[PDB]
Amino acid sequence: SDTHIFIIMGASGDLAKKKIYPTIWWLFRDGLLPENTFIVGYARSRLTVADIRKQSEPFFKATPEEKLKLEDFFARNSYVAGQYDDAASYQRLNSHMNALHLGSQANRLFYLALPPTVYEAVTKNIHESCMSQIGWNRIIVEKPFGRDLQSSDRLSNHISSLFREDQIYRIDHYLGKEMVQNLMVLRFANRIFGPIWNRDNIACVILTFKEPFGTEGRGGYFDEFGIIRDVMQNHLLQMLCLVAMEKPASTNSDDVRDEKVKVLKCISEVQANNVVLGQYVGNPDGEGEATKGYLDDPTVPRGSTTATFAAVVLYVENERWDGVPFILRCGKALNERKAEVRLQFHDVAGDIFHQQCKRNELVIRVQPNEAVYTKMMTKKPGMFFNPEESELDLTLPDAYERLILDVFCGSQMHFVRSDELREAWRIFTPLLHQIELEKPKPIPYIYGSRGPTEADELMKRVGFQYE
Amino acid sequence: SDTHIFIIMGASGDLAKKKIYPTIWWLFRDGLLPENTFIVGYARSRLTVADIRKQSEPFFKATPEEKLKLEDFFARNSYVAGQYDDAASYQRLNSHMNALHLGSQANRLFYLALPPTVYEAVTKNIHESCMSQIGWNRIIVEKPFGRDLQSSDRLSNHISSLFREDQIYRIDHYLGKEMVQNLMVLRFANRIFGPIWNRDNIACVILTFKEPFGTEGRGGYFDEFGIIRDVMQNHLLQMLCLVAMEKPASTNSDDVRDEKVKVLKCISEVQANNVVLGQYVGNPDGEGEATKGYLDDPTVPRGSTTATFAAVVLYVENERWDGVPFILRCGKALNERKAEVRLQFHDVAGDIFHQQCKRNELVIRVQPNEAVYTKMMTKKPGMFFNPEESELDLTLPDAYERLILDVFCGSQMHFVRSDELREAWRIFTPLLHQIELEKPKPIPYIYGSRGPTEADELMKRVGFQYE
Amino acid sequence: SDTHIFIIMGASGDLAKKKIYPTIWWLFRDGLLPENTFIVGYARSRLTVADIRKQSEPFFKATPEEKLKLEDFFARNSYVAGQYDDAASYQRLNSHMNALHLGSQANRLFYLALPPTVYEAVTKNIHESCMSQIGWNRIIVEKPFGRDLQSSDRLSNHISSLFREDQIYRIDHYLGKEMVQNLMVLRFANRIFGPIWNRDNIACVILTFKEPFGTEGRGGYFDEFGIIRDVMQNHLLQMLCLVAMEKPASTNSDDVRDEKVKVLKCISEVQANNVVLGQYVGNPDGEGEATKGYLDDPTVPRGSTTATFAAVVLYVENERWDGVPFILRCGKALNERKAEVRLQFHDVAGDIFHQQCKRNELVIRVQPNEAVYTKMMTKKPGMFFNPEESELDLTLPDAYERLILDVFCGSQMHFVRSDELREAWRIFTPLLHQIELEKPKPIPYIYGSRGPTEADELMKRVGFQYE
Amino acid sequence: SDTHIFIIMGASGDLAKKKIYPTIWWLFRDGLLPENTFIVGYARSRLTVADIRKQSEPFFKATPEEKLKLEDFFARNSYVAGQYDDAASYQRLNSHMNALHLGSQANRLFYLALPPTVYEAVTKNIHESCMSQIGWNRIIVEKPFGRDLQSSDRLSNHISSLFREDQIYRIDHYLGKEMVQNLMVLRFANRIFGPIWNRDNIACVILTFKEPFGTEGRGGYFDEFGIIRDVMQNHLLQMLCLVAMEKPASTNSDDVRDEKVKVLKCISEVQANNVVLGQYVGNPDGEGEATKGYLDDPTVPRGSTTATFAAVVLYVENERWDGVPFILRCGKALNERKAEVRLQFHDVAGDIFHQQCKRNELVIRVQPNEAVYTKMMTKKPGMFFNPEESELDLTLPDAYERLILDVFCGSQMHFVRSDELREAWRIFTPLLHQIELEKPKPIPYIYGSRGPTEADELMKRVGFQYE
């Protein structure tokens, strides 16, 4: 009922023209946005609503059955052209929002779709100029959240000196929020999976994020960060927190983020002997991009040791998880697109089935298709006591639509906190400093393969049984 | 390869002509019997193989495709007419077995299909004359195994003075052998269901045996025994033992039967305040037998307080099952045919879902439609943390064919032992003595109903949460 | 070194002249204070160091051997006479503080020994004038912390608007700091008491605080608060938190206080059916104060329903403590002085000792005669398997000296936090408002007795097995 | 009443004159034997009561105060001189037994104190002639119980063909029966030690039997057997069974020996890579026997590889003990005399005390100075969270007197069964056969030392944390 404003900062960027404008399209088309919602794209280059429409519609997946809606949404939008570090431009933007139907009373939601190098200014000029004194103000901030503990600490200190945690929404583009809630209901609403979610029963946890494509085109941007900062420090660590957290006092966002930050506090810094770093190389037998390696892109500087694959073993050192490995295995240009949580359970204490039993597994897959199944063992039909392994299933805006919708709803559970991000960077900072100090060479692996075999050796070493 | 002889004692009885002869039919037709297996019916009335064939074919459920095979089976059988308590008849029977291809070397398997009041004689004669000096000798003993602890004790003492436990096969017609193996593999090969199979997680165990029909025709025979001796003292108690047993040292029959008797040794005698007894009356509404009550059967003595339904709460007083109710609910002329094991689990400690979660259940239904499924809370598809109860499935000669096969293969695991039967009668003897001494009146319940509501009240009292 | 100042706000009060001045005297005498420490009393009435000495020496409990040291102590003291709500007086106090050896560089430690109704002013003035720009500033705040959730929230919001949690030290005079550390090392450094510290094994927790004396003289001050605010809302609740808290991420003060507030968050509001309130009356027989009841004290208003005894059952509704009662039993004019934690464990699952076993107990007695002992079953010497109950022991400035030392050392673990106090008041606020709205009459109990019998009945009802 | 006869078979042997006659002395003197108990020595050499008295009194340890009672005892005894394999002598012994006050009605208790090579004869004759038709008959059998599985099976089959298990009492001279009851009451009457008694908490179990002396003169008798048959196959294995057994259905002897044999059934055969064997050699620095080695004894055959020390790691492959080492360390000529059960517990999951905690231990020392104590971490008195290890104590005819009393009382709990002995020999037979086939050389260790260092290395390898 309350009027809302959606201010897309840096609306001329690729992220705005390809992923955010289509997302608010899909939210308004499905009737999920509040009825009184305005979309104010603000950027430097001078554009109009017609220009935004022309440059963004290809990604709208538009259909002729709903072109009428394609007008209404675009009658709800507006554009402001101004520099990111000019107070007059932000004054014009604030006046423009005020020059709307109940714009002063509206709840303002700033989606920062602009390079992080100018977050410091953009988050600053917002506070004095474009804030709302009646409705709430919320900023959505995109990664990179710095690159070290120090850089992230200074950026977070700036944003927290200006805004509060109730106004900061650090977004994770790879968080399903549907398999996350599936995890929470599975392990917290059920006594089947309650007592077994600890050291005594779980042997290892595997947290996977594989991509079948390399770093085509935008390989230079990936070079300065690496796969640990790109996927592992932020996403896989949040998945680890969700897997390993204790039951919160309630389903409140703060009560869940407290458990997650506690899990992060129980994790120590990463040692280089628990890390396998790999880099993908061209595949002579490939067809398309598979024949070109990471260093074959003309945008990647020569002799770059940036890892496109990482397998890292972590240990949550508390009463529930002491000694249980957490293998974060992420990679680009791998064989498949996969993102899942895998728990092997220990072998049953005392085998009366003649070593025919395999470790039970609980798999919560998020990509490509969501699923929740258990690999247990059932009696093989026949005349005999010989068990056989069976996979038993235990289980629609996509992940990104439901994440922008959380910022509207104020559900800040699935966004990383400031102390949470601080612990996340504390865990990985010494290892990253060592990596870009000594400059070790990552293991080369073929495009489309499963990654370096040293990763498999490391998982086997830490206690992972593969059939 | 070894030659076998199958001696059907009392082959003229209804049990042999309707259940045993068709079963050896289906075992030979399916190629499951050993190739050199002879069938020797033995009874009082002068009959021939042709007479047995005439009395047996309607229940054989044969087809024209295998009628030639029929001849083979009926070229394989033989008949002996002799009194059950005459040594000359048993000498003739032993000579007749000796007058077969390798009859002296054959393994002899006696199925005692004759009234229990004659057992004490027949077994004696079997030991005197018809035993085999080369191959093994095995007797299949049919229930009733006495009426109480004293009668069962004397019968078992006689049979054990003659034969050993390796030769005694006390058969349970209602035991699946298929879903029992599912139980054992599920709870002993899987770590998912291992740690949760105890006091801490399981709230109650419900062992059910319902029949939708009454005691038509043969109601007088049921009158002298009652539903406790009919279904509960023998079958449901074995199901209880299988559910509650510790993991055996191996899958050997003796190692499993030791756990069964150990479970029985820690069940106290049944108290009448944990027992609800009912008797079915006619559903006037109508149907067929539904309109005839238990006492409306002319063969049932007038003023009979025999219970056709019983709900009994037991407690396995040991480290794993202290305080966990075991509700044996058995009944005739109930609403449905059902035989299942139901484990409710405790409510999750700490409910963050606003009392929306329901107790998890593990259901192992043996008949009809064998199934193994868990009712647990899954995330309701949508937008919020809403748990909803969902039923997730975790899962061929019939039970009787696979039980006669056990005596051939020597798998004695699914047959009750002498000490196991002694404990089974020890548990129920005081209650049965009280019932047939005081003669309480069972609660009348409508034919086709769910039984007396006092059973539901008793389960609610002992800790059964019904939704 | 790092010169310190100890500012006793309200040094003319009874608390300063009887408990605070002797405590800092014993801390300086024992060589526990930092060498460069000044004690600056500040009050309204015009006094001097000689007057403070005259009013303080009888409570100093000094000896002629160390009298010279006493002189040294009084060489480090000074006095300032100024009103509590006068900015000029605080300017003079700050100037006097600066007029010391490195007074500007000194770490200032304010002990607020003045009535709570003045706190709102004093803290303000302390923030305006008497802050230190170089060293740290710490305030020690005495109870009462308000009368309910609203008053405590007001005072806490004021103090937190001025000071931060690193500067607020809310003192608990009844907390040992000695047996708390024994409790933490017992349940966190030992695997003997780790796994058993939960629902599965612990039947109930009893937290006791008894005083053998009544409310002599100062009965009017106790009238406006009651035993729930006096001892139960603040002290016994912190003992509950220490008993029930999860293992912290470290021994840091914040990591422990986080677990304590997490335990508080999962305790529901108190219901009047879980509360037994009592008032002590004259033990006629008596001898001294025992002959005078609570209402016989002339300063107590007539017809006062203030409870001098309370037995309250709480439930920590989380995974570790769901369903386990926590009986806080506190009282004045009871039979003995006692303050202990008592855990009964559950009965052993499966009794092979013919019901001769009693529930195991773990007792952590804080005063008098600090002890840790388990009551378990040991084999009675002789020829037989008959266990007998045996008490086995598992186990220096007093508590108050070690608490003032914490504020110097910065160990803020044993002081209540703002959110901790908020949850503590949230638990008890509805019950207290109901008590002072309906005005129920507490059960009268004899001076020197064990309390009302309804408390024993309530413990027996909730699951306390007293042998 | 129920007059008793105590038949010492082989009363002229050293075991009778040094251990048995003094034991029945101490049993009769203490008023522990039944009043009408007769002692009948039976041997080959022609002796009288006076000769037995002369060879017995020096070991009786008598005092002048009770010398009168002495004649009573020697007025109670009798002697029969007859060959061990002569039916006429046994008929004479039976007639002499009948030639006593109510000798025919007496309960006969035969203590076989004669070389094992004669057992097969003696028992036979005992069954033919000397049995009692009215009272019970009980034979006490002494180790060796064969040399391996085959010999023990032969002897046990013979004795079980003659006697039943209710009549066989296989004696263990090293079993306390006082600290065994302490074990059972400790771990079965207490919830403190119940849940923690498993894989999740116990790291290793150490069962020790050290002797400070070596084979003095009877090294020839020890040579044919070795320390595995002498102390480990029989005594330490029973200690293992008592430590590892599940809770019996009752304190009945059969219910306890069932759990013991069930524990034995889930122990695999011993592998030579889990065995360290040692032989003691003379110590130049010794004074008495310490300077003579095992091979320095003229009775020991030259080049004897008999192990006087053994450290063997076993694994009870069941639900409660899978993967938990059971280190049986036994030895002769070691540093001290000791026999204890030691349980180390696992390190606490999550150390908040900076690697200062040591593994908790539960020690049940049987000799010398019987004790039960736990080593756990207690808070070191002071100002600090640093724990220190502390030893907390949790705790009369000698063991042999209480064992002969058990045979009188019919308590067969602490004697090894036929199937128990069969499993015990099954575990150790392959290893002993390998030892006698390959003839490995044991590690030489100094007399009075702690044993070979390879034993310490083996324990460290299997998971024993020594501080």
UniProtKB/Swiss-Prot annotation, chains A, B, C, D:
Q: Which disease is it linked to?
A: Anemia, congenital, non-spherocytic hemolytic, 1: An X-linked disease characterized by G6PD deficiency, acute hemolytic anemia, fatigue, back pain, and jaundice. In most patients, the disease is triggered by an exogenous agent, such as some drugs, food, or infection. Increased unconjugated bilirubin, lactate dehydrogenase, and reticulocytosis are markers of the disorder. Although G6PD deficiency can be life-threatening, most patients are asymptomatic throughout their life.
Altering residue 251 to S: what's the impact?
In CNSHA1; Chinese-1; class II
Outcome of substituting residue 153 to V: In CNSHA1; Santa Maria; class I
Cell compartment(s), UniProt: Cytoplasm, Cytosol; Membrane
Impact noted for substituting residue 138 to H:
In CNSHA1; Naone; 1% activity
Variant or mutagenesis effect after changing residue 403 to F: In CNSHA1; Telti/Kobe; class I
Instruction: Give a GO biological-process term.
Output: lipid metabolic process
Q: Which GO terms describe its molecular function?
A: D-glucose binding; glucose-6-phosphate dehydrogenase activity; identical protein binding; NADP binding; protein homodimerization activity
Name the reported effect of residue 78 to C. In CNSHA1; Vancouver; class I
Q: Which residues form the active site?
A: 235
- What this protein is called in its record is Glucose-6-phosphate 1-dehydrogenase
Q: What is the effect of changing residue 422 to L?
A: In CNSHA1; Canton; class II; frequent in China
What result is annotated for mutating residue 293 to V? In CNSHA1; Bhavnagar; decreased enzyme stability
**Metabolic or biological pathway, per its Swiss-Prot or TrEMBL entry:** Carbohydrate degradation; pentose phosphate pathway; D-ribulose 5-phosphate from D-glucose 6-phosphate (oxidative stage): step 1/3
Q: Which Gene3D superfamilies match?
A: Dihydrodipicolinate Reductase, domain 2, NAD(P)-binding Rossmann-like Domain
**Changing residue 412 to H: reported impact?**
In CNSHA1; Cassano; class II
Instruction: Describe, as the record does, how this protein assembles with itself and its partners.
Output: Homotetramer; dimer of dimers. Interacts with SIRT2; the interaction is enhanced by H(2)O(2) treatment. Forms a ternary complex with ALDOB and TP53; this interaction is direct. ALDOB stabilizes the complex inhibiting G6PD activity and keeping oxidative pentose phosphate metabolism in check.
Q: What is the effect of changing residue 135 to S?
A: In CNSHA1; Mahidol; class III; associated with reduced density of Plasmodium vivax but not Plasmodium falciparum in Southeast Asians; reduced activity
Q: What taxonomic lineage is listed for the species of origin?
A: Eukaryota, Metazoa, Chordata, Craniata, Vertebrata
Q: Which residues bind NADP(+) 1?
A: 10-17, 44, 119, 143
Per its database record, what is this protein's job? Catalyzes the rate-limiting step of the oxidative pentose-phosphate pathway, which represents a route for the dissimilation of carbohydrates besides glycolysis. The main function of this enzyme is to provide reducing power (NADPH) and pentose phosphates for fatty acid and nucleic acid synthesis.
Substituting residue 246 to K results in: In CNSHA1; Corum; class I
The effect annotated for residue 160 to F is: In CNSHA1; Sassari/Cagliari; class II; frequent in the Mediterranean
Per the UniProt entry, the effect of residue 307 to T is: In CNSHA1; Chatham; class III
Binding residues for D-glucose 6-phosphate: 143, 173-177, 211, 230, 332, 337, 367
